[PDB]
């Protein structure tokens, strides 16, 4: 649906 990822989703 297009959600923004959390701060640590790309750590």
């Amino acid at each position: 649906e297009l959600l923004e990822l959390d701060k640590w989703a790309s750590l």
């Epitope: 990822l5 959390d6 701060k7 989703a9 750590l11």
Partner: antibody, heavy 132, light 108 residues
Framework: RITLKESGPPLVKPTQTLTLTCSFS??????????VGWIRQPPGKALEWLAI???????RYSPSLNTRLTITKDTSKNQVVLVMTRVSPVDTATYFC????????????????????????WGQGITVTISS | ALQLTQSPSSLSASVGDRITITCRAS??????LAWYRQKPGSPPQLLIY???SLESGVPSRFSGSGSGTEFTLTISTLRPEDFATYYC?????????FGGGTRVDVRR
Amino acid sequence: RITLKESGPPLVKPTQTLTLTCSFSGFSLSDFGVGVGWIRQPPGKALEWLAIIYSDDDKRYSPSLNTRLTITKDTSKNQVVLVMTRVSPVDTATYFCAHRRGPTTLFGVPIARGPVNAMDVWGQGITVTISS
Amino acid sequence: ALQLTQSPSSLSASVGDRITITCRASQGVTSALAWYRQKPGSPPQLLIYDASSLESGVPSRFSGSGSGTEFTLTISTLRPEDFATYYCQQLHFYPHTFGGGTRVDVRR
């Protein structure tokens, strides 16, 4: 030991601005990856996420509330403030602030992000009623 | 946005029972999910973090499993202080969604 505590006015009138304060101890908003968030709960209802702020000053807000919310921290006083403008009766709820761990580090190097997936310590909560 | 549905919404049980609660997400949230117990008049208390990690100080009768879109919480042996409301929280996407909760009361 980590402890948070919410303070503010128990009563506010519709159209008014509600300012809430989360005073904590046991951690710093200068500590790596640490966050402090706000969650609310209308009486007899479910938890509803409002916002979060991190020690690097990164901020996020609930999309259905972002035109009325402002979150700010005061690193030196160990506080986080939440401002909600133009409140109405649906805003009456118990407001909670909570701590979010930052990533685990080993010799100043993030090695585990698992502990960030939760709000681990909560304040007791403050009850706010909105009535004219 | 993301939907976080708990099942069941209500549940009756007795001391000693093994109960399971579930939380489904409308989209994959990886392992970024937390479980909390909330007794009336108190703030939610963390039980499980990152879908299956047992939070320190929390009794071993609490366990969490699953990833992606299906999560479950199980309390192997219900104690009296477990009669309460449970919540699940997603932290993979902003906003950090909470489930609707499932109430656990005394069966009669």
